[PDB]
């Protein structure tokens, strides 16, 4: 157990230098709890806290025997959520509930934790490993991330108004939602090795979740932002968390694993409420800032002018697919 | 799933008044992340973060169908850990991984979460519920607690010196560690209804973990404290996390569930490395403060003068049981 944990512990320590000299630097003293130096850079700060797991994507990792990217998924889900209040991610703790202390599994998990932490700019400051074979049939990974945002700079969605521009940033793929549906629909029929548009089914299902920290932090530092939505459970329904105004959108072509799922009988109205459908993060900006917002985001990832916020209330119209959510 | 989650969300919203006006008050704005007001009460603050779970105690809860105390266990484990750096607990998020969105189970879990939050003085500000029947055989409950400690007031263990007094605070019972051993040893032999000293075996195994926030916060604000150890996994071995110095201890009588376990053949040296054996929390203070520390702690719970820190580096001698760990 401790021997398996050594790989995670040593990797976590290597991420401390990501917050060296910055807000959130780990104190690295004492025991039982991690310490983060809040500092005085932020005059009147709010602390932002999120909690997110990977989901049954970890069952795909276990099936194929490739565990070196689920740490990226866990970190991505948490830090991408933190962005949605306008916070800069600082640090993360992991909850790792496992059926056995398999040292090879833990070593691989640590590799992805390090890569995800590097990309998100966060230190992994502690966590808990619970070996519970009676309770866990596999390797469950979740976490809690902490960020910081100035009072007065919190982005809630309250400033969203009709006419605002809606911009989508491409996902890397399926990310970490809808895997239960995808696993049940596709794996018995096709097999994990099935080749679809140049990639095996398991590669489509295990593609690591994209991390949006760098584009979004650059965006909020450069333009006024009215809303930020990480596209997770519920798909486009997450936009309704930001505002009661409506949306009229043109969504990107249905491609990759989403096309295969649709071709296996899942209707589009359901797909847009389950899968990210190619858009992993959506920003809402005053229409005056649309061009500059799209240019900042496009420097990092393929991004899309999706549409507008509408005076019509509550509805999400995906116009090029004839769908209303 | 939304029906079942409503039970916990409603209860968590009711805990917000526990931090109303105090440091750590939650903000009623935003989504995706919880927001905590750090305030001006602290001049140079460290943010303290812990992650801890209930363990397979939740399998006893599921066996008997009584879930309204495992939330106390989860909150207690986290806030008791936070105390060990000298931090005042502020807020908590829960990670709830379940085999199904059972509304009666969630309703019961919420009751214990509320009771634990009230006893610990923390707000429950968010969390994740993950419905994953292929991965979770039961209802797994864990969480992360956040607290605050002034930079100069961190209790590190660095100040522990030979001659320091070692004081134990009684546990409420088995707490949340050693349940795998207790379940495997006792349940098939005796049955959950087996009556021992007036309590059924499941009542012994499910007894909620004690919360030490009140005595420890009073202690640190009154006397010089050199070390604080919540007795969790590893039992007395947790004392070795605080210092390289040794310990000479007299442990309390073996009673209750620990006596039944001992009489079923578990050796005492193993027992002191697995179970809390009646001592849930240990403090280390200068010898001159021993009587004051005992008086403060004894206002709240039965407490023990256990012994002294020794120059015998790295050893824990339990001399009244002839044991060295």
UniProtKB/Swiss-Prot annotation, chains A, B:
It is found in: Cytoplasm. Pathway: Purine metabolism; IMP biosynthesis via de novo pathway; 5-amino-1-(5-phospho-D-ribosyl)imidazole from N(2)-formyl-N(1)-(5-phospho-D-ribosyl)glycinamide: step 2/2. It is an enzyme of class 6 (ligase). CDD domains: PurM. It comes from the Archaea. It catalyses: 2-formamido-N(1)-(5-O-phospho-beta-D-ribosyl)acetamidine + ATP = 5-amino-1-(5-phospho-beta-D-ribosyl)imidazole + ADP + phosphate + H(+). Gene3D superfamilies: PurM-like C-terminal domain, PurM-like, N-terminal domain. Its EC number is 6.3.3.1. Keywords: ATP-binding, Cytoplasm, Ligase, Nucleotide-binding, Purine biosynthesis. One of its GO terms (biological process) is 'de novo' IMP biosynthetic process. One of its GO terms (molecular function) is phosphoribosylamine-glycine ligase activity. InterPro entries: PurM-like_C_dom (IPR010918), PurM-like_C_sf (IPR036676), PurM-like_N (IPR016188), PurM-like_N_sf (IPR036921), PurM_cligase (IPR004733). Pfam families: AIRS, AIRS_C. One of its GO terms (cellular component) is cytosol. NCBIfam families: purM. Belongs to the AIR synthase family. This is Phosphoribosylformylglycinamidine cyclo-ligase. It comes from Pyrococcus abyssi (strain GE5 / Orsay).
